[PDB]
Amino acid sequence: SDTVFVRETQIPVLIERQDNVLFMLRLNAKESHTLDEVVLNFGKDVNMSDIQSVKLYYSGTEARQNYGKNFFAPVSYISSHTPGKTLAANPSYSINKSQVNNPKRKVALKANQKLFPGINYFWISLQMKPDASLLDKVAAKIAAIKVDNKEALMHTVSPENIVHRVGVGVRHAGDDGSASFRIPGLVTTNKGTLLGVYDVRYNNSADLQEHVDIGLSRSVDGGKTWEKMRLPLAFGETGDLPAAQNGVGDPSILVDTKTNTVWVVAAWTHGMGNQRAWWSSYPGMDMNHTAQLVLSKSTDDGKTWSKPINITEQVKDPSWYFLLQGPGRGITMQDGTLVFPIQFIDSTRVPNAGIMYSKDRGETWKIHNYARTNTTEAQVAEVEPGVLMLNMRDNRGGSRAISTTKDLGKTWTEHSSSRKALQEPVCMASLISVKAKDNVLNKDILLFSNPNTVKGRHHITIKASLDGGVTWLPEHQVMLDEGEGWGYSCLTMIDKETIGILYESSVAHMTFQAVQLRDIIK
Template structure:
């Protein structure tokens, strides 16, 4: 009997929790270790959101495994600074609820340290169970902070624990600059952003009060301003609102699709937007606009400007008469952002619809063309280029090192229902849009799901010398607006290597984005979620790596 007691004591010591934490320890009742996967999702932690599901834990048991409960989970973070960034950690369980998936908290802690443990009492039913890790950021967290989870240890009721090293992914923070429902607005869409000489970030967007519908609707142009690199944002200002012009209701005087431009030589901000007053509330302006020049007939190309770093703005300025061909059905800006060239020329990307006597390849009534609108006298007069390619719409423009202009265009041939997804169209002009040449990368180098995108140019120090680099952002997906990604090209857009790419948000959104250089080492990007606008700061080194 004494010998039996001694054997039992030795066995209890060998299977106690105080054993090795780095490897799986399997109780005598199990015939095989539990299989565990921890997948870090490519999504940011939004400072304004209480729940941010950043990882998935999958537990797979063997058929004869008798494990009944998950009793604890421990996170090993790479940096003790996590306690200054994260307010709390939650573990969620998914359970069917009215044929939909809803999440329920099963454990949490606000005692955040480099090694953080959550005690649990969670039943494990079935052979496969899934849980979600959610992080809540501190409201004053530095948006440039980064988080890495090096190890996750799961503890079970049969006195076993198992260590897992998740996929290597740096978790970044993000701001929700505009939230759905904020300021009594249903939807915020169509981002544009620039950096002023004073270092201020100026963000513009649609304020869609009633729903997410495009024009014609009750839509104004909103602006948000940050003077600390995007760490905080001032309250929204409405900078373009056509009111009840012509005695018609607000929803018949919507103005939207903004494109922002900064003249760094005169320190003037310009915003272009599309307005029309004649369509009914049931009309979509894209189709209701007709040949002609009056607001009751056709969309109007409107400008507003600020000469005091975005503090105050002019009344809307109508330049339709200067640049629109009366035979065209519609002319509008970008949207997104324009540029100030090295010689001071101001350039907005633009698009127009022209009836060429046959239906568009997309099955539409007219054929659309991307182009540019520009001013050589600091905005006193404006001119327009020719169409770069048929069936192209929303575009962005950059100046290349030789002074030519590159137009990167949404190509409406890229429709998943047409079975053709050949990517962004690209053309170059050396004569301010009078003529265009197809760029070698056109329609194959940058996959897209028929969406607006962003491209900017910057001088970056690479291997000790200054080099012109192009940065591009869009949903990096041929078929859906998922996977918001920034890419870099160091050869004027000929190639966009995989090693010069970073995925910011794998989740689905409305997909539009706009970038700006905050400084020569940091990119700021404003992009769409679903009815919300997100802002992130990305170090150039995170994209270009050891270069």
């Protein structure tokens, strides 16, 4: 008899999506003629009342030259990039054969599908109810597959005990008339409010220069619901140039914990035609030559935002081609110092990462010296009181560079974990510090998120360290998204027991998920 091969997915189940890929099935029908039924059994701890439906789709066959390459689908079933068509499976690729609404723990999906004389693809779709909980975890097993009125042999290539986690598509391609959204940042205010920022790339997914604003999504219920998008930074037709030559992007957001004032920094690019700002920003200081470093602040918990504050002259050396924040978030140090990670292309056209700080609540800012040559995007965390650790994207490739400074960036010391402990494909990565006093474990922990690979942007993973970043033990990690995406992410603590992550996922341009602290550190 033929073998039905099964691959269980490990990707976020978006609560608002009408379809989510849960299982992929492949059957090479050498002696099979009809697939009658698939029986699915949810785990005993699954809350069935938060599940809206389960569906079985048929997706046809494969090109004969691709036989034996171990594919489990002929095409991507659910788009995350087609504007206005990212919530349901593309009907031209998948035929709904059976659907069970308000399912019980045991679900029988009767297909009665005539099989192509060759490879046949099926997949199981999971749809949550809109009010499902962010911490809901879904587990399931395929109990039986009936083929030609007999139980078919199954071989599952994916591992056991997969936990399917839900998430929220804070931004989908096409939302509010924007083709794409990129570059996430995420913080939690003193009031518990979640503030997520991102590029609003209206025309397409291209970097600056282009028509780009900084958008912001605000949540007061721990990320379950998000308020109408705000625009903290947008320059429109400033200087009488087109909006596409006034983009602002790569945002970084921080909360001044002493006052709860929220700060957002971004890079405003003026002119430069339709070329990339990385190669179009030049030495100088004014808007007509070089990118401008602009700030916007909020004193009402992120609801309203001031007009841009141009701080370029405070911190940029004229010889630099390009000074900009490190996208993601900044911090408030224990002593009240505000710190944003930064990066600048020096006179030799080589980028270097560093930090920018303010000791007067954000009125004035300063930069000293870079941490390491040929580095770009970085995030900073106060590992110990007075000790800042900078975790850097390194153009040398393969792994993150990590250095610390006790004097706010005048001098730097290479860290033991540098270029060894944290692999990367050269991509943005998030780092935050959570003190024992502010979490249920009562221990100082570092949290880190990036694509846990050296090649490609996939397997988005949160990692935790209990020894100041010296070791990242494998059992203290959660893999959230095996699919391919743009790879950027940003972390925060929703509260003392829950982690929050806003990242570019394989299922939505801006994906938010909540992860319990005791799920990662067991």
